[PDB]
Amino acid sequence: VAFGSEDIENTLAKMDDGQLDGLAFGAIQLDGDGNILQYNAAEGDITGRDPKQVIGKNFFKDVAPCTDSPEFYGKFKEGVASGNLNTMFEYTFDYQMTPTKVKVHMKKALSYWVFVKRV
């Protein structure tokens, strides 16, 4: 299934760890506070983070400080509160990694998904 699909959250609701690892794009599931619930292999291939050891950490505070901005975290908090998170934007990831341009799609789970692909 494809990055940015209209019903991506339906598909991914059905998936186990291995299936999530099979996705063509990075996929992170966060709680409303930004704690990491799921993190797939494709994401780790972009960021050099071991998916097994980031589970439970806080994405915005600890893992991904560069995303702590109105343009990313602010859009996340707005969507958690309004209940209708579904937004796509370009971003650069550059904390403890080579600076890497990405496209991000955040979407409420059918918990909140952050999907990532290289650009």
Short mmCIF file of all heavy atoms in Angstrom, two decimals, residues 25-79:
data_model
loop_
_atom_site.label_atom_id
_atom_site.label_comp_id
_atom_site.label_asym_id
_atom_site.label_seq_id
_atom_site.Cartn_x
_atom_site.Cartn_y
_atom_site.Cartn_z
N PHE A 25 7.53 2.74 2.88
CA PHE A 25 7.78 4.00 3.55
C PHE A 25 7.94 3.79 5.05
O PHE A 25 7.50 2.80 5.64
CB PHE A 25 6.65 4.99 3.25
CG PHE A 25 5.28 4.39 3.51
CD1 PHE A 25 4.69 4.51 4.76
CD2 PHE A 25 4.58 3.73 2.52
CE1 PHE A 25 3.41 4.03 4.98
CE2 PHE A 25 3.31 3.23 2.76
CZ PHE A 25 2.74 3.32 4.01
N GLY A 26 8.57 4.78 5.67
CA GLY A 26 8.67 4.77 7.13
C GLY A 26 7.32 5.01 7.78
O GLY A 26 6.50 5.80 7.31
N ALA A 27 7.09 4.30 8.88
CA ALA A 27 5.82 4.40 9.59
C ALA A 27 6.11 4.36 11.10
O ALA A 27 6.79 3.46 11.57
CB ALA A 27 4.88 3.27 9.18
N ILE A 28 5.64 5.38 11.77
CA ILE A 28 5.78 5.58 13.21
C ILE A 28 4.38 5.75 13.77
O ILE A 28 3.59 6.53 13.24
CB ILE A 28 6.62 6.84 13.55
CG1 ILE A 28 7.97 6.87 12.82
CG2 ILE A 28 6.78 6.97 15.07
CD1 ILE A 28 8.68 8.17 12.97
N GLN A 29 4.05 5.08 14.86
CA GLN A 29 2.80 5.33 15.54
C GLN A 29 3.11 5.96 16.91
O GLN A 29 3.97 5.42 17.59
CB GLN A 29 1.97 4.07 15.69
CG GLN A 29 0.54 4.32 16.14
CD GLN A 29 -0.20 3.00 16.26
OE1 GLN A 29 -1.32 2.89 15.79
NE2 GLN A 29 0.35 2.03 16.96
N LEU A 30 2.47 7.09 17.17
CA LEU A 30 2.63 7.86 18.38
C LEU A 30 1.33 7.88 19.18
O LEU A 30 0.22 7.88 18.59
CB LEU A 30 3.00 9.31 18.04
CG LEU A 30 4.28 9.52 17.21
CD1 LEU A 30 4.50 11.01 17.00
CD2 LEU A 30 5.48 8.88 17.86
N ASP A 31 1.43 7.99 20.49
CA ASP A 31 0.27 8.37 21.30
C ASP A 31 0.09 9.87 21.24
O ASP A 31 0.85 10.57 20.56
CB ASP A 31 0.29 7.79 22.69
CG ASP A 31 1.38 8.31 23.61
OD1 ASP A 31 1.95 9.37 23.30
OD2 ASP A 31 1.59 7.71 24.68
N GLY A 32 -0.90 10.42 21.95
CA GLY A 32 -1.19 11.83 21.82
C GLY A 32 -0.12 12.72 22.42
O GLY A 32 0.00 13.89 22.06
N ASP A 33 0.71 12.14 23.29
CA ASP A 33 1.82 12.84 23.91
C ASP A 33 3.12 12.72 23.12
O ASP A 33 4.12 13.30 23.52
CB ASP A 33 2.08 12.32 25.32
CG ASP A 33 1.04 12.72 26.34
OD1 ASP A 33 0.27 13.66 26.06
OD2 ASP A 33 0.99 12.00 27.36
N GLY A 34 3.09 11.97 22.02
CA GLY A 34 4.27 11.81 21.22
C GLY A 34 5.16 10.65 21.60
O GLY A 34 6.29 10.54 21.09
N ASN A 35 4.72 9.75 22.48
CA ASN A 35 5.51 8.55 22.80
C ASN A 35 5.36 7.53 21.66
O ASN A 35 4.29 7.36 21.08
CB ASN A 35 4.98 7.96 24.11
CG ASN A 35 5.07 8.96 25.24
OD1 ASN A 35 6.12 9.52 25.52
ND2 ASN A 35 3.97 9.16 25.95
N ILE A 36 6.49 6.89 21.35
CA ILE A 36 6.52 5.97 20.22
C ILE A 36 5.95 4.61 20.57
O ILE A 36 6.44 3.92 21.49
CB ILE A 36 7.95 5.84 19.68
CG1 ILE A 36 8.45 7.22 19.19
CG2 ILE A 36 8.05 4.78 18.61
CD1 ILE A 36 9.97 7.22 18.96
N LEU A 37 4.88 4.22 19.90
CA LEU A 37 4.20 2.95 20.01
C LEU A 37 4.69 1.92 19.01
O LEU A 37 4.81 0.76 19.35
CB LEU A 37 2.69 3.11 19.80
CG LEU A 37 2.01 4.14 20.69
CD1 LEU A 37 0.55 4.30 20.34
CD2 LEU A 37 2.18 3.89 22.16
N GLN A 38 4.92 2.32 17.77
CA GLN A 38 5.44 1.46 16.71
C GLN A 38 6.43 2.26 15.86
O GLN A 38 6.28 3.48 15.73
CB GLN A 38 4.37 0.89 15.80
CG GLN A 38 3.22 0.10 16.43
CD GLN A 38 2.25 -0.55 15.47
OE1 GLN A 38 1.03 -0.31 15.47
NE2 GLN A 38 2.77 -1.45 14.64
N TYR A 39 7.39 1.58 15.29
CA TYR A 39 8.43 2.19 14.48
C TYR A 39 8.94 1.11 13.53
O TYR A 39 9.49 0.13 14.02
CB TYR A 39 9.53 2.71 15.41
CG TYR A 39 10.53 3.66 14.84
CD1 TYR A 39 10.46 5.03 15.09
CD2 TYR A 39 11.62 3.23 14.10
CE1 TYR A 39 11.42 5.90 14.62
CE2 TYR A 39 12.55 4.10 13.59
CZ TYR A 39 12.47 5.45 13.86
OH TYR A 39 13.42 6.32 13.35
N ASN A 40 8.80 1.30 12.22
CA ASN A 40 9.11 0.21 11.32
C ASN A 40 10.53 0.21 10.79
O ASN A 40 11.31 1.15 10.92
CB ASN A 40 8.07 0.07 10.21
CG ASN A 40 8.23 1.09 9.09
OD1 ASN A 40 8.91 2.09 9.26
ND2 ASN A 40 7.53 0.86 7.99
N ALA A 41 10.85 -0.89 10.11
CA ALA A 41 12.19 -1.07 9.58
C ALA A 41 12.53 -0.03 8.53
O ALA A 41 13.65 0.50 8.48
CB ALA A 41 12.32 -2.49 9.06
N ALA A 42 11.56 0.37 7.69
CA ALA A 42 11.82 1.34 6.66
C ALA A 42 12.19 2.71 7.23
O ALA A 42 13.06 3.40 6.72
CB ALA A 42 10.69 1.52 5.68
N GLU A 43 11.63 3.05 8.38
CA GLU A 43 11.97 4.30 9.05
C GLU A 43 13.40 4.25 9.54
O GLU A 43 14.16 5.22 9.41
CB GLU A 43 11.00 4.64 10.16
CG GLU A 43 11.21 5.99 10.83
CD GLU A 43 11.04 7.17 9.92
OE1 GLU A 43 10.59 7.04 8.78
OE2 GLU A 43 11.33 8.34 10.37
N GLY A 44 13.75 3.15 10.21
CA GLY A 44 15.12 2.98 10.67
C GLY A 44 16.13 3.05 9.53
O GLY A 44 17.25 3.52 9.69
N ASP A 45 15.75 2.60 8.33
CA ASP A 45 16.66 2.68 7.19
C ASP A 45 16.91 4.11 6.76
O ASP A 45 17.98 4.43 6.23
CB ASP A 45 16.18 1.87 5.98
CG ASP A 45 16.15 0.38 6.20
OD1 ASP A 45 16.77 -0.14 7.14
OD2 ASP A 45 15.50 -0.28 5.38
N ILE A 46 15.97 5.01 7.00
CA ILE A 46 16.17 6.43 6.73
C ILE A 46 16.98 7.10 7.81
O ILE A 46 17.79 7.98 7.53
CB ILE A 46 14.78 7.10 6.58
CG1 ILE A 46 14.04 6.53 5.35
CG2 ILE A 46 14.86 8.61 6.45
CD1 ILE A 46 12.61 6.98 5.25
N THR A 47 16.75 6.73 9.07
CA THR A 47 17.23 7.59 10.16
C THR A 47 18.38 7.01 10.96
O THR A 47 18.99 7.73 11.77
CB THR A 47 16.09 7.89 11.17
OG1 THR A 47 15.70 6.67 11.78
CG2 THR A 47 14.85 8.40 10.47
N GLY A 48 18.64 5.72 10.78
CA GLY A 48 19.67 5.02 11.50
C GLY A 48 19.41 4.74 12.95
O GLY A 48 20.30 4.44 13.74
N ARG A 49 18.19 4.69 13.38
CA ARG A 49 17.61 4.40 14.65
C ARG A 49 17.20 2.94 14.61
O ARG A 49 16.61 2.49 13.64
CB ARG A 49 16.46 5.29 15.07
CG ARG A 49 16.85 6.56 15.78
CD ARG A 49 17.56 7.56 14.88
NE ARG A 49 17.68 8.87 15.51
CZ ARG A 49 18.16 9.96 14.96
NH1 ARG A 49 18.58 9.95 13.70
NH2 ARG A 49 18.18 11.11 15.65
N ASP A 50 17.57 2.21 15.64
CA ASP A 50 17.15 0.83 15.76
C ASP A 50 15.68 0.84 16.20
O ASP A 50 15.36 1.34 17.29
CB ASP A 50 17.99 0.14 16.84
CG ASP A 50 17.66 -1.31 17.06
OD1 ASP A 50 16.82 -1.91 16.40
OD2 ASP A 50 18.33 -1.87 17.96
N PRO A 51 14.78 0.29 15.39
CA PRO A 51 13.36 0.32 15.73
C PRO A 51 13.05 -0.34 17.06
O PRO A 51 12.10 0.04 17.74
CB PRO A 51 12.75 -0.48 14.58
CG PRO A 51 13.65 -0.22 13.43
CD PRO A 51 15.04 -0.22 14.03
N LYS A 52 13.83 -1.34 17.43
CA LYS A 52 13.54 -1.99 18.71
C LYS A 52 13.81 -1.09 19.90
O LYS A 52 13.20 -1.21 20.96
CB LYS A 52 14.36 -3.28 18.82
CG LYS A 52 14.11 -4.27 17.69
CD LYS A 52 14.95 -5.52 17.86
CE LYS A 52 14.17 -6.77 17.47
NZ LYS A 52 15.07 -7.89 17.10
N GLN A 53 14.79 -0.19 19.80
CA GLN A 53 15.14 0.59 20.98
C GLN A 53 14.52 1.96 21.07
O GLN A 53 14.54 2.57 22.15
CB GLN A 53 16.65 0.59 21.18
CG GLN A 53 17.18 -0.84 21.35
CD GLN A 53 16.64 -1.59 22.54
OE1 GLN A 53 16.51 -2.83 22.53
NE2 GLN A 53 16.31 -0.93 23.64
N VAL A 54 13.84 2.45 20.05
CA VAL A 54 13.12 3.70 20.15
C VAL A 54 11.71 3.55 20.71
O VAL A 54 11.05 4.53 21.09
CB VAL A 54 13.10 4.51 18.84
CG1 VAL A 54 14.49 4.92 18.40
CG2 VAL A 54 12.34 3.72 17.78
N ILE A 55 11.17 2.33 20.75
CA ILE A 55 9.82 2.17 21.30
C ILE A 55 9.79 2.66 22.75
O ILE A 55 10.63 2.29 23.58
CB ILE A 55 9.41 0.68 21.29
CG1 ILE A 55 9.49 0.05 19.89
CG2 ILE A 55 8.07 0.46 21.94
CD1 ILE A 55 8.67 0.74 18.82
N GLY A 56 8.83 3.52 23.04
CA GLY A 56 8.60 4.08 24.35
C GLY A 56 9.20 5.46 24.54
O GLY A 56 8.88 6.15 25.50
N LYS A 57 10.11 5.84 23.67
CA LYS A 57 10.73 7.16 23.81
C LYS A 57 9.80 8.24 23.30
O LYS A 57 8.85 8.00 22.59
CB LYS A 57 12.02 7.16 22.99
CG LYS A 57 13.06 6.17 23.49
CD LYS A 57 14.42 6.42 22.88
CE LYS A 57 15.54 6.04 23.84
NZ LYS A 57 15.36 4.68 24.40
N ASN A 58 10.13 9.47 23.70
CA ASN A 58 9.35 10.58 23.24
C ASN A 58 9.92 11.18 21.96
O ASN A 58 11.06 11.63 21.89
CB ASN A 58 9.19 11.65 24.30
CG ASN A 58 8.11 12.59 23.76
OD1 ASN A 58 8.46 13.50 23.07
ND2 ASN A 58 6.84 12.26 24.02
N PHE A 59 9.10 11.11 20.92
CA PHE A 59 9.56 11.51 19.59
C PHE A 59 10.00 12.97 19.57
O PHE A 59 11.03 13.27 19.00
CB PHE A 59 8.44 11.20 18.58
CG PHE A 59 8.82 11.46 17.14
CD1 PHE A 59 9.59 10.58 16.40
CD2 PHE A 59 8.33 12.60 16.49
CE1 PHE A 59 9.95 10.86 15.11
CE2 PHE A 59 8.70 12.86 15.19
CZ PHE A 59 9.47 11.98 14.47
N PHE A 60 9.18 13.90 20.08
CA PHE A 60 9.42 15.31 19.94
C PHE A 60 10.47 15.88 20.88
O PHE A 60 11.16 16.84 20.52
CB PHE A 60 8.09 16.08 20.05
CG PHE A 60 7.10 15.67 18.98
CD1 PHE A 60 5.99 14.91 19.20
CD2 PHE A 60 7.30 16.09 17.69
CE1 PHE A 60 5.14 14.59 18.17
CE2 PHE A 60 6.50 15.78 16.62
CZ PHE A 60 5.40 14.99 16.88
N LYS A 61 10.61 15.26 22.05
CA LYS A 61 11.56 15.70 23.04
C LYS A 61 12.94 15.12 22.83
O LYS A 61 13.94 15.82 22.94
CB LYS A 61 11.07 15.38 24.47
CG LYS A 61 12.07 15.86 25.51
CD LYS A 61 11.75 15.37 26.91
CE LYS A 61 12.69 15.83 27.99
NZ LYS A 61 14.13 15.50 27.81
N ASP A 62 13.00 13.82 22.54
CA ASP A 62 14.24 13.08 22.66
C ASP A 62 14.72 12.57 21.30
O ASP A 62 15.90 12.64 21.01
CB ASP A 62 14.17 11.98 23.72
CG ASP A 62 13.98 12.54 25.12
OD1 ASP A 62 14.73 13.44 25.55
OD2 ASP A 62 13.01 12.06 25.74
N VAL A 63 13.88 11.94 20.50
CA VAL A 63 14.33 11.27 19.31
C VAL A 63 14.59 12.23 18.16
O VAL A 63 15.59 12.14 17.45
CB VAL A 63 13.34 10.15 18.89
CG1 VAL A 63 13.76 9.48 17.61
CG2 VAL A 63 13.26 9.14 20.00
N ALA A 64 13.66 13.13 17.96
CA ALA A 64 13.54 13.97 16.77
C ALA A 64 13.37 15.44 17.14
O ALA A 64 12.37 16.06 16.78
CB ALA A 64 12.39 13.40 15.93
N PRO A 65 14.36 16.05 17.79
CA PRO A 65 14.21 17.43 18.26
C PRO A 65 13.99 18.39 17.12
O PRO A 65 13.38 19.45 17.26
CB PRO A 65 15.47 17.70 19.04
CG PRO A 65 16.48 16.73 18.50
CD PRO A 65 15.66 15.49 18.20
N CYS A 66 14.50 18.08 15.91
CA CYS A 66 14.33 18.96 14.79
C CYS A 66 12.87 19.09 14.39
O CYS A 66 12.52 20.06 13.71
CB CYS A 66 15.18 18.56 13.59
SG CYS A 66 14.57 17.18 12.62
N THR A 67 12.01 18.18 14.83
CA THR A 67 10.60 18.20 14.51
C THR A 67 9.80 18.98 15.55
O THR A 67 8.61 19.18 15.38
CB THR A 67 10.02 16.78 14.37
OG1 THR A 67 9.94 16.15 15.64
CG2 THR A 67 10.82 15.91 13.44
N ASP A 68 10.46 19.44 16.59
CA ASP A 68 9.85 20.23 17.64
C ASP A 68 9.80 21.68 17.13
O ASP A 68 10.70 22.48 17.37
CB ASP A 68 10.63 20.08 18.95
CG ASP A 68 10.09 20.93 20.08
OD1 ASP A 68 9.06 21.59 19.91
OD2 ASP A 68 10.73 20.95 21.17
N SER A 69 8.76 21.95 16.36
CA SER A 69 8.56 23.22 15.68
C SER A 69 7.08 23.38 15.39
O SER A 69 6.37 22.38 15.30
CB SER A 69 9.33 23.22 14.35
OG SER A 69 8.71 22.31 13.44
N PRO A 70 6.62 24.58 15.09
CA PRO A 70 5.21 24.73 14.69
C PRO A 70 4.86 23.96 13.43
O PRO A 70 3.74 23.54 13.20
CB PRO A 70 5.04 26.24 14.47
CG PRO A 70 6.12 26.87 15.26
CD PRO A 70 7.25 25.91 15.25
N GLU A 71 5.82 23.79 12.55
CA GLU A 71 5.62 23.18 11.24
C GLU A 71 5.42 21.67 11.32
O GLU A 71 4.94 21.10 10.34
CB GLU A 71 6.81 23.52 10.33
CG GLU A 71 6.96 24.97 9.93
CD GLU A 71 7.44 25.90 11.02
OE1 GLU A 71 8.20 25.46 11.90
OE2 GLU A 71 7.13 27.10 10.91
N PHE A 72 5.80 21.03 12.41
CA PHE A 72 5.70 19.58 12.55
C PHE A 72 4.95 19.31 13.85
O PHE A 72 3.76 19.01 13.82
CB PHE A 72 7.06 18.92 12.37
CG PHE A 72 7.09 17.42 12.19
CD1 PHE A 72 8.01 16.87 11.32
CD2 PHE A 72 6.26 16.54 12.84
CE1 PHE A 72 8.05 15.50 11.09
CE2 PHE A 72 6.30 15.18 12.66
CZ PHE A 72 7.27 14.66 11.84
N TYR A 73 5.62 19.35 14.98
CA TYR A 73 4.99 19.12 16.28
C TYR A 73 3.75 19.98 16.44
O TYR A 73 2.73 19.50 16.94
CB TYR A 73 6.04 19.41 17.36
CG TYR A 73 5.67 19.11 18.79
CD1 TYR A 73 4.81 18.11 19.18
CD2 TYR A 73 6.24 19.91 19.77
CE1 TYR A 73 4.56 17.92 20.53
CE2 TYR A 73 6.01 19.72 21.10
CZ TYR A 73 5.14 18.72 21.48
OH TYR A 73 4.93 18.56 22.82
N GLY A 74 3.78 21.26 16.04
CA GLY A 74 2.61 22.11 16.19
C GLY A 74 1.44 21.54 15.41
O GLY A 74 0.31 21.56 15.93
N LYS A 75 1.64 21.09 14.19
CA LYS A 75 0.59 20.47 13.36
C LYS A 75 0.11 19.16 14.01
O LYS A 75 -1.09 18.88 13.98
CB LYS A 75 1.08 20.21 11.92
CG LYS A 75 1.30 21.46 11.08
CD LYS A 75 1.63 21.18 9.63
CE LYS A 75 1.58 22.43 8.77
NZ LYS A 75 1.99 22.19 7.36
N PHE A 76 1.00 18.41 14.64
CA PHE A 76 0.61 17.19 15.36
C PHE A 76 -0.33 17.54 16.52
O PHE A 76 -1.40 16.93 16.63
CB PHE A 76 1.86 16.49 15.86
CG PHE A 76 1.61 15.24 16.68
CD1 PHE A 76 1.39 14.03 16.06
CD2 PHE A 76 1.62 15.32 18.07
CE1 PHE A 76 1.15 12.89 16.81
CE2 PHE A 76 1.37 14.17 18.82
CZ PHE A 76 1.20 12.97 18.18
N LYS A 77 0.09 18.47 17.37
CA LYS A 77 -0.73 18.81 18.54
C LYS A 77 -2.09 19.36 18.12
O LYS A 77 -3.15 19.05 18.70
CB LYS A 77 0.05 19.75 19.47
CG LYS A 77 1.15 18.99 20.21
CD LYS A 77 0.57 18.00 21.20
CE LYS A 77 1.43 17.80 22.43
NZ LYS A 77 1.07 16.50 23.08
N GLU A 78 -2.11 20.12 17.03
CA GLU A 78 -3.36 20.69 16.53
C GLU A 78 -4.32 19.60 16.10
O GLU A 78 -5.53 19.60 16.32
CB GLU A 78 -3.07 21.55 15.31
CG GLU A 78 -2.53 22.92 15.68
CD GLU A 78 -2.91 23.87 14.54
OE1 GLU A 78 -2.60 23.47 13.40
OE2 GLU A 78 -3.60 24.85 14.84
N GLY A 79 -3.78 18.60 15.42
CA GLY A 79 -4.61 17.49 14.97
C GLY A 79 -5.06 16.56 16.07
O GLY A 79 -6.14 15.96 15.99
#
